[PDB]
Design an enzyme around this catalytic site. Structure first.
Site, PDB file in Angstrom:
ATOM      1  N   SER A  49       0.756  -1.322   0.006  1.00 29.62           N
ATOM      2  CA  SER A  49      -0.044  -0.159  -0.125  1.00 29.62           C
ATOM      3  C   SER A  49       0.919   1.344  -0.090  1.00 29.62           C
ATOM      4  O   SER A  49       0.322   2.201  -0.137  1.00 29.62           O
ATOM      5  CB  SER A  49      -0.828  -0.093   1.380  1.00 29.62           C
ATOM      6  OG  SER A  49      -1.699   1.182   1.137  1.00 29.62           O
ATOM      7  N   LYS A  52       0.822   4.048  -2.806  1.00 32.73           N
ATOM      8  CA  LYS A  52      -0.228   5.190  -2.803  1.00 32.73           C
ATOM      9  C   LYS A  52       0.358   6.416  -2.454  1.00 32.73           C
ATOM     10  O   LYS A  52       0.010   7.554  -2.753  1.00 32.73           O
ATOM     11  CB  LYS A  52      -1.453   4.921  -1.784  1.00 32.73           C
ATOM     12  CG  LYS A  52      -2.316   3.732  -2.136  1.00 32.73           C
ATOM     13  CD  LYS A  52      -3.308   3.684  -0.999  1.00 32.73           C
ATOM     14  CE  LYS A  52      -4.134   2.577  -1.351  1.00 32.73           C
ATOM     15  NZ  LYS A  52      -3.568   1.084  -0.701  1.00 32.73           N
ATOM     16  N   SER A 298      -6.376   3.828   3.664  1.00 32.33           N
ATOM     17  CA  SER A 298      -5.657   2.974   2.571  1.00 32.33           C
ATOM     18  C   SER A 298      -6.743   2.570   1.568  1.00 32.33           C
ATOM     19  O   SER A 298      -6.964   1.044   1.637  1.00 32.33           O
ATOM     20  CB  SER A 298      -4.841   2.081   3.055  1.00 32.33           C
ATOM     21  OG  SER A 298      -3.952   1.516   2.193  1.00 32.33           O
ATOM     22  N   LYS A 410       2.282   6.178   6.199  1.00 30.82           N
ATOM     23  CA  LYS A 410       1.356   5.046   5.343  1.00 30.82           C
ATOM     24  C   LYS A 410       1.761   3.605   5.608  1.00 30.82           C
ATOM     25  O   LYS A 410       3.064   3.265   5.354  1.00 30.82           O
ATOM     26  CB  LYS A 410       1.340   5.573   4.050  1.00 30.82           C
ATOM     27  CG  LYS A 410       0.492   4.476   3.199  1.00 30.82           C
ATOM     28  CD  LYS A 410      -1.084   4.971   3.266  1.00 30.82           C
ATOM     29  CE  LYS A 410      -2.195   3.964   2.613  1.00 30.82           C
ATOM     30  NZ  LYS A 410      -1.997   2.620   3.463  1.00 30.82           N
TER      31      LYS A 410
HETATM   32  B1  LIG Z   1      -2.335   1.203   2.339  1.00 30.58           B
HETATM   33  C1  LIG Z   1      -2.746   0.010   3.428  1.00 30.58           C
HETATM   34  N1  LIG Z   1      -3.284  -0.834   2.808  1.00 30.58           N
HETATM   35  C2  LIG Z   1      -3.011  -2.418   2.904  1.00 30.58           C
HETATM   36  O1  LIG Z   1      -2.032  -2.564   3.847  1.00 30.58           O
HETATM   37  C3  LIG Z   1      -3.658  -3.285   2.157  1.00 30.58           C
HETATM   38  C4  LIG Z   1      -4.953  -4.090   2.606  1.00 30.58           C
HETATM   39  O2  LIG Z   1      -5.438  -3.758   3.847  1.00 30.58           O
HETATM   40  C5  LIG Z   1      -5.345  -4.793   5.041  1.00 30.58           C
HETATM   41  C6  LIG Z   1      -5.263  -5.080   1.752  1.00 30.58           C
HETATM   42  C7  LIG Z   1      -4.961  -5.481   0.662  1.00 30.58           C
HETATM   43  C8  LIG Z   1      -3.712  -4.808   0.089  1.00 30.58           C
HETATM   44  C9  LIG Z   1      -3.152  -3.669   0.929  1.00 30.58           C
HETATM   45  O3  LIG Z   1      -1.996  -2.911   0.372  1.00 30.58           O
HETATM   46  C10 LIG Z   1      -1.394  -3.104  -0.885  1.00 30.58           C
END
Ligand SMILES: *[B@](*)(*)[C][N]C(=O)C1=C(O[C])[C]=[C][C]=C1O[C]
Ligand SMILES: [Mg+2]
Ligand SMILES: [Mg+2]
Length: 466
Positions: A49, A52, A298, A410
């Site tokens: 994530s 982002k 996120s 993040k």
């Molecule tokens: B930006 C935070 N998002 C994540 O860590 C995330 C999920 O949340 C649990 C699910 C799937 C993918 C992902 O990040 C790539």
């Protein structure tokens, strides 16, 4: 105590949870640009994530802080004195925050402009973006879940949290022996239903499964839910978001006193219409305010949509190809070296992205002096804050440590991946940091990440609120 800080990070990295794992860590003072620490800074890794960070950066560039996303309703000509109109079009342009009340308040305007009857068919026009819904290398077995919702230009977000392309599914128990009740939420009478679930005895085996079988639009429920069990609610993704938006609009139009005599489907504004009659519009909040529920929580769906609306602006094509080149460009233009970066989506869901940690910190450095610096940092999850819309995915991490209420950063985590990068603002100069690791076999090394983040918050001039 600067040599002494290195001793500390060196040690925190000898952790036995980072077995076989390539971890990449950079820490940089902003005010003096001095590199505080660097380990495998130019190694190429999957950023989950954290991707982002780049997306949100390019989104503020290409689109601006002040950018809003429009949604409108179109017939061929004005409504008949009788009331009658022909085919009508709900046309979206990549609003990632379009709601149910938003749809309804659009349905008001159609009624409140002389329409009493659609004698034709109702069409959903998500053609602002192409219809490529999922990225090449997303896993088909993930598709049922929110973080993996299909990508449309016209997608109905659910909730305070604006989770796109999804439906809330409630499963309540009955008495034991009777099958469970199943609410399909928004997708009621849109999405198919197979309910093989049953109420088990009081205080027995809760083995409830909710799933949308790959390549169908059926919500399939299996297993037993005990009779005394507190009702189950679950977000699931549906097929063709835009068509669900069309259905929810047929429903909105009817309750707002407008009959639809035809069907709901997909289809574009024919372009063989000259001065098409726009009889309802809706503007979404500005990007700066949308950054909040996106970054804090996120939001995957959001990032892709932004990528696609980036490709729109720069190239006039909501394509993943188009946008990602746009994301690449904006970054370059911001002073950030995009050498080690490989772009594959905006959310970092795909395992075919790559970032170096040097690159992250580079981008953190740069974005720290752009006009939108203040809106960009406002959106980053703040460490240990109870308030969901502030804490984000750092709500229940680092509470009562030097880090709490100090560290904006993040998160990101998948099977075999995890990252945590952002700022540690203190009396001892603004701090930017990057922690990205792959290869680890256990859970995401959040303890290890947190430990590094906290120690930096101490070094910066911070103390635990106990
Ligand atoms: B930006 C935070 N998002 C994540 O860590 C995330 C999920 O949340 C649990 C699910 C799937 C993918 C992902 O990040 C790539
Ligand atoms: Mg319904
Ligand atoms: Mg503090």
């Amino acid at each position: 105590r600067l040599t002494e800080l290195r001793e500390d990070i060196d040690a925190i990295l000898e952790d036995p949870a980072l077995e076989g794992a390539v971890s990449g860590v950079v820490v940089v003072d902003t005010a003096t640009g001095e590199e505080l620490y660097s380990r495998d800074g130019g190694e190429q890794l999957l950023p989950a994530s954290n991707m982002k960070l780049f997306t949100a950066a390019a989104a503020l560039e290409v689109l601006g802080a002040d950018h809003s996303f429009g949604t409108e309703v179109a017939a061929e000509s004005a409504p008949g004195r009788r009331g009658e109109v022909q085919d009508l079009y709900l046309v979206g342009r990549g609003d990632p925050t379009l709601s149910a009340e938003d749809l309804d308040a659009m349905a008001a305007e159609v009624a409140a402009s002389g329409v009493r009857t659609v004698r034709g068919d109702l069409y959903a026009d998500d053609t602002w973006f192409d219809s490529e819904r999922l990225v090449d290398d997303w896993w088909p077995e993930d598709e049922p879940y929110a973080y993996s919702a299909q990508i449309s230009a016209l997608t109905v977000a659910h909730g305070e949290r604006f989770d796109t392309g999804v439906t809330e599914v409630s499963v309540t128990p009955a008495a034991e022996g009777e099958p469970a009740d199943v609410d399909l939420g928004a997708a009621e009478g849109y999405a198919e239903l197979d309910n093989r679930a049953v109420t088990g005895a009081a205080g027995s085996a809760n083995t409830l499964v909710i799933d949308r079988p790959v390549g169908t639009n059926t919500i399939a429920v299996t297993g037993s839910l005990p009779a005394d069990a507190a009702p189950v609610t679950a977000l699931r993704t549906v097929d063709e978001p835009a068509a669900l938006a069309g259905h929810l609009f047929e429903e909105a139009l009817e309750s707002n006193g407008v009959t639809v005599k035809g069907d709901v489907g997909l289809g574009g504004v024919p372009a063989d219409w000259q001065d098409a009659e726009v009889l309802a519009d809706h503007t979404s909040a500005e990007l700066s305010e949308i950054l909040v529920p996106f970054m804090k929580f996120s939001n995957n769906g959001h990032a892709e949509m932004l990528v696609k609306s980036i490709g729109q602006e720069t190239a006039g094509a909501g394509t993943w190809d188009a946008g990602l080149v746009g994301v690449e460009e904006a970054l370059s233009g911001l002073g950030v070296d995009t050498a080690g970066l490989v772009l594959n989506d905006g959310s970092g869901l795909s395992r075919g992205n790559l970032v170096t940690a040097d690159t992250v910190v580079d981008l953190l450095g740069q974005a720290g002096s752009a006009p939108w610096a203040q809106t960009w940092s406002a959106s980053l999850p703040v460490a240990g804050e109870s308030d969901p819309f502030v804490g984000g995915t750092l709500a229940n991490r680092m509470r009562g440590t030097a880090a709490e209420g100090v560290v904006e950063a993040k998160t990101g985590t998948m099977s075999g991946v995890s990252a945590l990068s952002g700022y540690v603002p203190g009396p001892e100069g603004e701090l930017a940091f990057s922690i990205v690791n792959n290869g680890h076999s256990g859970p995401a090394p959040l303890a290890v990440q947190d430990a590094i983040a906290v120690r930096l918050a101490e070094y910066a001039g911070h103390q635990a609120p106990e």
